[PDB]
Every structure is written in C-alpha cells, then in structure tokens.
Design an enzyme around this catalytic site. Structure first.
Site, short mmCIF file in Angstrom:
data_model
loop_
_atom_site.label_atom_id
_atom_site.label_comp_id
_atom_site.label_asym_id
_atom_site.label_seq_id
_atom_site.Cartn_x
_atom_site.Cartn_y
_atom_site.Cartn_z
N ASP A 35 0.84 -1.19 0.00
CA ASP A 35 0.00 0.00 0.00
C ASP A 35 0.88 1.25 0.00
O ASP A 35 1.34 1.68 1.06
CB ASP A 35 -0.92 -0.01 1.21
N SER A 199 -0.42 15.57 -12.09
CA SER A 199 -0.63 15.20 -13.48
C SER A 199 -0.88 16.45 -14.32
O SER A 199 -1.40 17.46 -13.84
CB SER A 199 -1.84 14.27 -13.58
#
Length: 330
Positions: A35, A199
């Site tokens: 994770d 992004s």
C-alpha cells in the site's frame, strides 16, 4: 541488494493485489497488500480477536525465534474506505522477494474492522508511503522500504501491476525489460506523507488532451481512480446511459457498454488506461448495471491515482534524497 516479488490480484476484478512476505524465523509467509498510500506493516496474528479472523493466515510471534516485543508500542490506523485496525508491535525479520530487513516493526493486530475480516485473501498490509505517516506510538516506526533503502543497489521500488493478471514489485533496481519507451519522472511532495504529484491533464477516448494540473497520490492500496468531479463527468458523459447513483455510491453504467479509454498526463508524456480497465462489473450479482472504475474525489479531499491508473503503467517510486515518481507505458 535487491528484491523481486510477484503480486497477484485477489479476485477477478483486481480489487486488490497480494504479495507473499516472509516474517520471522522460521519464516511465516503471509500475503500482504502493498500500500503506497499508508505506512504501517500490520498483520493478522495470534493476538487478533478470534471472531475477527475468518480464513486469513496469521503471524504467531511466539513461534519466531527472532521476534521481540517492542515494549509499550501500540498502533491504530483508519483508512479512507472507513476500515481500521489496531494492536501492539513486535520487531522481526521480514523478507520480500529475497530482500531481508532485520528489526522491522511488525504491527500485530488485536482488532480489525469487518471489511478486513470479510476478506480472507488479505493477511495484512505493507505500507510504502513515507514513514512520517506510521501510526506506532510513542516511537514512530519506519517502513520496510525505509529500513531497506541504505542496503539497496538504488533507493527505489517499482510497481508493475497486472490487468486481470499477476505483476511485480521490485526493490532496489529498475527492470528495463518491463516497460516500453522511456520513463518520465515527475516531482513529488512529501508534505502529506504520500507519493503526491501533479498530473498535467487528461483525455477521454480519442478526444483532445485537456492541459490542467491535477494534484493526487499514487496509491497502490486504492482500487479505483478518483479525480475531480469535472473530469469524471467529462469521462462518463461519453458512455450512453451512465449516471451517478447516490444509492450505489458512484457512477454506474450499462453493462452492455463499451467503455472509452482514459489518458492522463505525466509531464509531456501520456499514460493510456484502456476502457476495459474501467469496468468493475455488476453492482450486485446478476445486475445489468456495472460499477465504474473512475469516480469522483469530491468527498475524499484528495485525488487518488489508484490501481486502475497505476496498472496501466510501470511506476518507479524513487526514494532518493529528493523523491520523485516515474511512469512508463508497458
């Protein structure tokens, strides 16, 4: 040193991935959910409330000659999906894919919430976010990666998740056979303890690319792709009959649909998520309403590049003094 371990989807939807991890002496192998969105290595154990164990493999510290109680240490964690676990702490030897850390904090669960009990395939979590998020008190503990870093050939790990197929976590090296083209690296902020990056935009299907900054986290422990409501609405508007359902808890679409791809930007590069990766199947057995793999982050507080996005790429988690993320097509 290096390590290399195969990671395998837990079910036919890629809801999560499990990676075998050796703990203790002699080794006890547990299948952990790696994770990158959390920083605790915790396991089902001989100390877990018996009614909360249903098929998981347990760590039994009393059977490990290298286990030592970390006296006074406790832990307690809550995840973004509302699940939680807590307990006490041992140190022990932990190996992943041939890479061994001695003295790793292994957080033994005394209690786990229902979603953990109900998932027999996940024996615990191995956190790979920054150690500043580790919940052990009163002495915060380091992640497996942080403990291994100095011994690694290069201070990196990579995630290569499969679509409906196994993939690989590598530690300490970048497998140049595992991706196509070049790796594009992008800056990371560690201020929230996550692999947080920005992004450069998105496209829906064959549509034009929209240049826009989307701050979010690379999170192998989250199944879906959670993005701003504007982006998610633009995606689902291209699917006839798709709608956001408050009763189901997100966007659903007719199971008869063919889904468009979704592209996200990494600097000047582009990662394409095929439409099939966005299909999470019937909302309930036999339903013709299917659950979408791109969902709004509006209720979360952060955008999350979960498995839906990451499995479309070869992803480098660069833990150099100034961390960065790398993405390549594959």
């Amino acid at each position: 040193s290096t390590g290399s371990a195969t990671t395998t989807p837990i079910d036919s939807l890629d809801d999560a991935y499990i990676t075998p991890v050796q703990i203790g002496t002699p080794a006890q192998t547990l299948n952990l959910d790696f994770d990158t969105g959390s920083s605790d290595l915790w396991v089902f154990s001989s100390e877990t409330t018996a009614s909360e164990v249903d098929g998981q493999t347990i760590y039994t510290p009393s059977k490990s000659t290298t286990a030592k109680l970390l006296s006074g240490a406790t832990w307690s964690i809550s995840y973004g999906d509302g699940s939680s676990s807590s307990g006490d702490v041992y140190t022990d030897t932990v190996s992943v894919g041939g890479l061994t850390v001695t003295g790793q904090a292994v957080e033994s669960a005394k209690k786990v919430s229902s979603s953990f009990t109900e998932d027999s395939t996940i024996d615990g979590l191995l956190g790979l976010a920054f150690s500043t998020l580790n919940t052990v008190s009163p002495t915060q503990q380091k992640t497996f990666f942080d403990n291994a870093k100095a011994s690694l050939d290069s201070p990196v790990f990579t995630a290569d998740l499969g679509y409906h197929a196994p993939g690989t976590y590598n530690f300490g090296f970048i497998d140049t056979t595992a991706y196509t083209g070049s790796i594009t690296y992008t800056a990371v902020s560690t201020k929230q303890g996550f692999w947080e990056w920005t992004s450069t935009g998105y496209a829906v299907g064959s549509g034009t690319f929209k240049s826009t900054s989307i701050d979010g986290i690379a999170d192998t422990g989250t199944t879906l792709l959670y993005l701003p409501a504007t982006v998610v609405s633009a995606y689902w508007a291209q699917v006839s009959g798709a709608k956001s359902s408050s009763s189901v808890g997100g966007y659903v679409f007719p199971c008869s649909a063919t889904l468009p791809s979704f592209t996200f930007g990494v600097g000047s590069a582009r990662i394409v998520i095929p439409g099939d990766y966005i299909d999470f199947g019937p909302i309930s057995t036999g339903s013709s309403s299917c659950f979408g793999g791109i969902q709004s982050s509006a209720g979360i507080g952060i955008n999350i590049f979960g498995d839906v996005a990451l499995k479309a790429a070869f992803v480098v988690f660069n833990g150099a003094t100034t961390p960065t993320l790398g993405f390549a097509s594959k």
